[PDB]
Design a protein around this ligand. Structure first.
Ligand SMILES: *[C@@H]1O[C@H](CO)[C@@H](O[C@@H]2O[C@H](CO)[C@@H](O[C@@H]3O[C@H](CO)[C@@H](O)[C@H](O)[C@@H]3O)[C@H](O)[C@H]2NC(C)=O)[C@H](O)[C@H]1NC(C)=O
Ligand SMILES: *[C@@H]1O[C@H](CO)[C@@H](O[C@@H]2O[C@H](CO)[C@@H](O)[C@H](O)[C@H]2NC(C)=O)[C@H](O)[C@H]1NC(C)=O
Ligand SMILES: *[C@@H]1O[C@H](CO)[C@@H](O[C@@H]2O[C@H](CO)[C@@H](O)[C@H](O)[C@H]2NC(C)=O)[C@H](O)[C@H]1NC(C)=O
Ligand code: NAG
Ligand code: NAG
Ligand code: NAG
Ligand code: NAG
Length: 168
């Protein structure tokens, strides 16, 4: 029962950014026989750590790993974007009580100011130099649709809206 982990945790990334997919293993692993299935199609890497460099739209997809005698892991979907601001979430679905981190991500990792996060059309939090609205203990009422607004350079921008569900 393997489980694909990511680093950054962000599973919604811009174009050209890099992400690393590690197969069920927190720190140190042994085997050299690891399988990767990008969109189902077997991959060319064997190492347990499948890196992804300059993010091309084609990288967006469904992945998974399996060992010699283990049933393939629950696929994970990676989406790549091109836009001024992208709203990133730790996980999109959560178990009541778990942690939750949302991030109003600027393009080219620039700097965003006058930030405001919104949940279900309501103003929620606000800062100058931006922040990362974080949640330790997650309530089910936290489930909703978020999006953020901010000033890049000297213009305002709105982010694509994102759904989030906290089940019990
Ligand atoms: C795995 O399957 C997914 C299908 O969801 C593939 O992702 C899709 O890839 C295409 C081509 O990169 C994306 O569309 C492109 O968008 C640009 C910009 O809007 C446009 O100018 C191009 O003409 C093209 O339409 C498409 O949106 C994307 N799907 C999603 C949801 O992001 C992915 O490429 C597949 N992986 C492999 C290795 O085939
Ligand atoms: C993705 O990885 C690349 C490679 O490490 C990063 O760009 C590197 O930038 C350094 C400058 O310190 C150069 O020495 C390398 O040659 C560059 N690598 C490549 C492949 O061009 C890049 O910054 C990473 N992406 C992000 C978002 O940080
Ligand atoms: C987020 O979830 C909401 C539902 O909570 C989706 O909105 C519904 O969309 C369907 C069809 O698009 C409509 O029939 C419903 O009336 C909508 N509900 C509301 C309250 O507007 C929404 O499409 C989802 N968005 C994403 C990005 O997944
Ligand atoms: C290759 O695998 C080892 C562990 O077997 C790991 O420490 C290392 O980071 C991996 N290298 C790459 C490029 O994935
Ligand atoms: C492993 O996969 C087989 C089918 O190939 C399935 O019967 C079995 O239940 C799986 N292992 C576990 C722990 O579920
Ligand atoms: C908060 O978000 C920023 C983005 O500006 C990121 O670089 C940083 O690592 C995050 N801080 C923490 C403590 O996770
Ligand atoms: C999380 O918060 C709930 C109340 O909202 C509380 O009952 C529970 O003990 C908290 N969990 C932890 C680990 O403190």
């Amino acid at each position: 029962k393997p489980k694909v982990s990511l680093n950054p945790p962000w599973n919604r990334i811009f174009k050209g950014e890099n992400v690393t997919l590690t197969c069920n293993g927190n720190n140190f692993f042994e085997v050299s026989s690891t399988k990767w299935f990008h969109n189902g199609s077997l991959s060319e890497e064997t190492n347990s750590s499948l890196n992804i460099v300059n993010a091309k739209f084609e990288d967006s997809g469904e992945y998974k790993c399996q060992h010699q005698q283990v049933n393939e892991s629950e696929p994970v979907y990676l989406e790549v974007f091109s836009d001024w601001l992208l709203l990133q979430a730790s996980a999109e679905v959560v178990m009541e009580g778990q942690p939750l981190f949302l991030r109003c991500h600027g393009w080219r990792n620039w700097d965003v100011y006058k930030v405001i996060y919104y949940k279900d059309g309501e103003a929620l939090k606000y800062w100058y130099e931006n922040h990362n609205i974080s949640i330790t203990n997650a309530t089910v009422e936290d489930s909703g649709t978020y999006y953020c607004t901010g000033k890049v350079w000297q213009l305002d921008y709105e982010s694509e809206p994102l759904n989030i569900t906290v089940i019990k």
